Design a protein around this ligand. Sequence first.
Ligand SMILES: *[C@@H]1O[C@H](CO)[C@@H](O)[C@H](O)[C@H]1NC(C)=O
Ligand SMILES: *[C@@H]1O[C@H](CO)[C@@H](O)[C@H](O)[C@H]1NC(C)=O
Ligand SMILES: [Ca+2]
Ligand SMILES: [Ca+2]
Ligand SMILES: [Ca+2]
Ligand SMILES: [Ca+2]
Ligand SMILES: [Ca+2]
Ligand SMILES: [Ca+2]
Ligand SMILES: [Zn+2]
Ligand SMILES: [Zn+2]
Ligand SMILES: [Zn+2]
Ligand SMILES: [Zn+2]
Lengths: 54, 222, 222, 219, 219, 213, 213
Amino acid sequence: TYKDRRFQYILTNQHLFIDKLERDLHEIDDEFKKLGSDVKDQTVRHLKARISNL
Amino acid sequence: TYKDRRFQYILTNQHLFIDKLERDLHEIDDEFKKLGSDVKDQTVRHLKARISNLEGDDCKEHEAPCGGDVPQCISDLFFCDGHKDCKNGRDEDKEVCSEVPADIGSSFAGVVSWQACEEATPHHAVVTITANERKEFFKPRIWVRAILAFEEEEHEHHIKTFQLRGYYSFGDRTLALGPERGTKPVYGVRCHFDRGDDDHADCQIVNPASLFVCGNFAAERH
Amino acid sequence: TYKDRRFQYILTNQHLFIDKLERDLHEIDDEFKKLGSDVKDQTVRHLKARISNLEGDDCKEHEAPCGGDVPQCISDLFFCDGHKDCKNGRDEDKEVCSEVPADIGSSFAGVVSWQACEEATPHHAVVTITANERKEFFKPRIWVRAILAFEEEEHEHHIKTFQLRGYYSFGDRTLALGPERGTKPVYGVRCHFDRGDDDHADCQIVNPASLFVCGNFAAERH
Amino acid sequence: DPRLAANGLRLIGLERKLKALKARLHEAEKIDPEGFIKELDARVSHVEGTHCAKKEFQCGGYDQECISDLFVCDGHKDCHNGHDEAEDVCDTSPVKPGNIFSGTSHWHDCLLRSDHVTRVVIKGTIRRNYFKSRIWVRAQIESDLIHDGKKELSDFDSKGYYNFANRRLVLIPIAQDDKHLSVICDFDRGDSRRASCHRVLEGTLHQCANLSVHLQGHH
Amino acid sequence: DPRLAANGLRLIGLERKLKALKARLHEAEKIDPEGFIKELDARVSHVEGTHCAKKEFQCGGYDQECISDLFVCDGHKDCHNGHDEAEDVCDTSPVKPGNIFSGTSHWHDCLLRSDHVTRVVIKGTIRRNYFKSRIWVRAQIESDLIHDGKKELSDFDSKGYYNFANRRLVLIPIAQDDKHLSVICDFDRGDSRRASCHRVLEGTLHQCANLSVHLQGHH
Amino acid sequence: SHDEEIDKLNEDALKLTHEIIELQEKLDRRSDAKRIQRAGSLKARVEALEDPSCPDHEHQCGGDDPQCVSDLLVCDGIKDCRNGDDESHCHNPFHAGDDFVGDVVFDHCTKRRPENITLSVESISVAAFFPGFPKLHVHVNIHKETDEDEVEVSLPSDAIYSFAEDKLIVYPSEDDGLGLVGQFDGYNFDRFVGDIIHEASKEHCARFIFHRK
Amino acid sequence: SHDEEIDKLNEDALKLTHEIIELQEKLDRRSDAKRIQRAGSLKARVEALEDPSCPDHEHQCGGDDPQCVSDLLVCDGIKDCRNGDDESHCHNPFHAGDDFVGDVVFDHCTKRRPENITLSVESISVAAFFPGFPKLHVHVNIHKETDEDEVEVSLPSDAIYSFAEDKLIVYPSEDDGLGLVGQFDGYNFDRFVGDIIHEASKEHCARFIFHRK
Ligand SMILES: *[C@@H]1O[C@H](CO)[C@@H](O)[C@H](O)[C@H]1NC(C)=O
Ligand SMILES: *[C@@H]1O[C@H](CO)[C@@H](O)[C@H](O)[C@H]1NC(C)=O
Ligand SMILES: [Ca+2]
Ligand SMILES: [Ca+2]
Ligand SMILES: [Ca+2]
Ligand SMILES: [Ca+2]
Ligand SMILES: [Ca+2]
Ligand SMILES: [Ca+2]
Ligand SMILES: [Zn+2]
Ligand SMILES: [Zn+2]
Ligand SMILES: [Zn+2]
Ligand SMILES: [Zn+2]
């Protein structure tokens, strides 16, 4: 039929839109990962300890 | 606004749909490319030529076929003389009457299997057209001066060269060569251009007198 | 019915509209075809080659240009020997190292303007490679045996033939020929394949000793 | 949504079209121009014959040079044009193990069988690096015989060789005195997929059956 | 009307497209690949020069044969390759009567004029059938001079010839002692539409002005 | 904005339409009926050069698994080939009303020695119980104008078409042993070779190349 | 019926779309910017081989009606050519942030004798009252690794671009007479030849081929 292909046409490019969004999300997340990292809890513990001692 | 983002939402995933379609098209086209290819027009021309030769013709000595849809045989002496003697005019066709196989500088070479005369093993032979003349009152022949030469080893250093004169006949598609005036009747050459083009020929190195075949080479234009 | 004829009425003059569009398209396309054509790739190749030759190179004797985007000069003896000596590897390019200009059966012909040695008027000269050898331990040269012959009138019948030996150098793009072993130092030939292909060359018929130019011909592969 | 909707309809149309074209691919694969011409070249070349002796290999197609078939695909360039080592010539896929050639055997001598399926099943190949001129083939020959009302398989183990020069597979029955006839196949159809075969007596090469196999292949 | 209407919209789209393409034709005509290459060939060939004497015509482009320019386009094949009678060579349209070549004259001798328009107007041609090597041209030379605040036309009647071999139009002033300088144009741009000209003194060929005409043509 | 973007959309869509139809055109060129036909004609010439694959009165089913089948069993509505080839030839090249015009190749036996012969098909009778050999009523039309006279002729004749042999057999209508036999290429069907043969000596004495008019 | 006919319509319409876009593609190929550029480059080589058409310090307006105009009047916002050529060159190949990498052709005067030189454009200052000669601040970056050491350098330098000559002039930053001059093809603008010249002897002692990175 034709109406079936219209409905399927809507479904098809909502999944496409979701896929685009997913790709964009991955780009942004990848961009965020290149902001260094958080710090080793041991480095912080030892730093705090050194300050305390001083 | 919101309506703007709805419109933009429709635009965005029509382009997405187009992109998907494009990718799918590329897949299908790639799948089609892996179905081999079409064929070299030379391979087909030569195949058709070989079939034609195997089929032969009902022509008499001193006749040649006109070619075409309705078979007709006419004289050697009637090809390319400016008057249409074939019912379909093929004896004056521009391709049939190609004077390229007898052009100055034309050289046809190939490896020779000998059967007599020369006791050497298979080497190249080259025949080179050095001069030509096509008389305007008698156009069905091109008179040519040629040179037959043999490929010989780096050690020989005493190469053999035979000067020839003869003609190219359009209907026969034949280059016929014999000894030049006063030059010791050693060799003659018979080349038949039957591969469907002006660039390949079946040659025999013969005795000028008996036309006895001394050797054969498949000639190719270089 | 009537509704059927309305639907059919719509179909009928959409096909009519398509037909009009097709006719208009054909008009426009026909108008576009009358804007000349594109150019023969050979004419462009040869033009580029002529420009390149006029530009020259900063190479020394026994050097040849590598070609390419960053100019570099390397030895005659380094072209096509299996090791890349050019920064861009051009001295081992498959086109540069084409051994076609020295192929057995290759013949290059053209009309000669003489300036000495021969007092005849402009006729053809043909030089035909009859043999070759490319030593595997020394690949930058192809050693060739050739024959220089002259086009002479139907009345002469005593043609002159000169047997030559020499080499083809890839970097130089040069076919250099001199007298065969023990054959009277009369003529040598220098052909330069500088038209951008393996099919045309600027030749001089020279004295083997002095390299003095006796005559020039524009050679073409037949 | 102005005519944006219309364009959407166009896009559905294009999707439909693409689907249809992809469907046409199956039918398009049934046409092999290059292979057709290769077949005709083979058949014509057979009608022509050659000027070479038996056990000789003619170099080019038009070319006049002959070579011993003991030098064909041996790793050494023997033809002036190197045809004896060309890839088409030296293709080893007619006897690639796993290949199952099937065809109808038509008997007209020796045995009184009606027309029936035969399979040549390539089981193994050995190609000595010191003698590449030939491939030593081991194969199973199976025949579906509807002998006595019911069906019955008649199979035997066999061994022989594929010779590149004449494109010929010879299989004689391994230690099978039991009246199993040899098979000789010629891959003379321009490819490595079809062969013109015969069931023959090994000693005399007398042809007892006509057999034409094609690869098909997958049981 | 299902999606028939949509298809109708598509058709309007195609109509619009066609209109646009037809519009692009004008801009497409401004590009002449073949003519561009012919121009470059001309200019390069000029830089190269030739090995021929003056008053000689070199046959091909690479070709070594020379011919007298009295034999060029005379109706007889004189070149081994017949180039001296070729259509491009023998084209008579540079001096087709009705042609109006216009250009800017830049003076640097003889006269003290500022830059100004000059027209070479071809008025007639005679080509004897017994001597086709040259075309005898009659033409009008017009110059727009803004001499004294206001504009004034300076024109004179002239006569000369177009020589095919060197593609040169020579026009000397008809009985014009009145200090009108001759004009010499070379159609050296690969076409019959543009020419590199000079205003010269007839006796000495001294160049008093640089002038480059193009056909344009229609008053 | 709301027009520039829409126009860019329409444009990309047109370009996609173009690329798609391009693929389709490759597909079409590959399977072009005329090309397949020409291929068949070529293959047929080759087959003519080869030794017959079948006994004198049989039919080669063809295919990658060849088979021979009696000529009398071709196109009788019963599948005898394992590939059913005998039952798919079955399109008669002649339809009531068809004209074929043949030009002379050689000729040394016909009465009028004409330049050309028109063969007109007038009717076709196909027995339902024997469809493999349709019967035709045709007219052989000749028009020869010599010096002494102008002669025109329209000879009604009976014919049979053999699907097995792709061959038209026209039985003579006049008082000479002269029959017309049209051999079809196998693939063309718009051209046949018309040999004129003595019904008795089997001697082949004339040949015309016929084309569908 | 009402679907078969519609489908045939859609089909004919697709085929029309294809033919139309084909015409468009011919049009596009003819006017392809890259092709026109290459043509310009070729023409430029030819022009280089010819005698200069203009006095030492002037600019050829070009066209079918040539004209010479002072180099100081090119790209100053006032039309001096009759065809306005002096006022349409005016696109600076260098933008702030551009990198060009040049590979050595020959070299016998530079300090480090490097394989390659990166020229980085850092800023551009265009005087509104004198736009024909933009001033650039660029850095010449070299990185040479020998046996004894590894040397890296980034020499800040001042430059001028001449629209009249399609030429970048980089004034030396170190204590040698060594300046860099980049000649543009006239049509490329993604590649220039960088000659190194003694500010004094005018001697040309090094050449690098620079490409836009
Ligand atoms: C038959 O032949 C004559 C010439 O011999 C010609 O005038 C006539 O038109 C021809 N008819 C056809 C159909 O060829
Ligand atoms: C410069 O050349 C060296 C090799 O000599 C290479 O490793 C480096 O990447 C090059 N730098 C650039 C930007 O070309
Ligand atoms: Ca004739
Ligand atoms: Ca090297
Ligand atoms: Ca070998
Ligand atoms: Ca002349
Ligand atoms: Ca049947
Ligand atoms: Ca200005
Ligand atoms: Zn059949
Ligand atoms: Zn009747
Ligand atoms: Zn400019
Ligand atoms: Zn800085």
